[PDB]
């Protein structure tokens, strides 16, 4: 096993298409992107619950308010 690890490192050094890292297929960047977008949207739409109380308005209307 030790010899094989050495040999693998050596042939990776000799080859050009060698992996830039000894890590396996990473597949958890999608979930990170999804939760980021989710938190962003959840903040954006937990804002406008507070910023749109909208008690009443005062519209100027011709003939009455003027």
């Amino acid at each position: 096993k030790l010899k094989l690890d050495a040999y693998h490192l050596l042939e990776a050094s000799q080859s050009e298409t060698a992996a830039k890292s000894a890590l396996s297929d990473l597949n958890w960047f999608s979930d990170l992107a999804d939760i980021y977008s989710g938190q962003q949207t959840m903040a954006e739409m937990d804002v406008a619950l507070k910023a749109q109380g909208e008690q009443k308005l005062s519209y100027p209307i011709q003939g009455k308010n003027i």
């Binding site: 519209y59 100027p60 011709q62 003939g63 009455k64």
Partner: protein, 52 residues
């Protein structure tokens, strides 16, 4: 001047008497009870607030 920096009473009256109160009374609850012209009411919103 006032027609350009204020809303017109005809535009008001139209929806006030034909659109809004025909939905419901005591609170004017919701809006599924309406025709497609709700979209026109929305357009009216985007005129009124964007002139006022």
């Amino acid at each position: 001047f006032l027609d350009t920096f204020t809303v017109k009473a005809t535009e008001a009256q139209e929806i006030k008497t034909i659109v809004d109160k025909c939905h419901k009374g005591n609170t004017f609850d919701f809006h599924a009870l309406s025709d497609e012209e709700l979209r026109r009411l929305e357009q009216l919103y985007s005129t009124v607030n964007n002139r006022v």
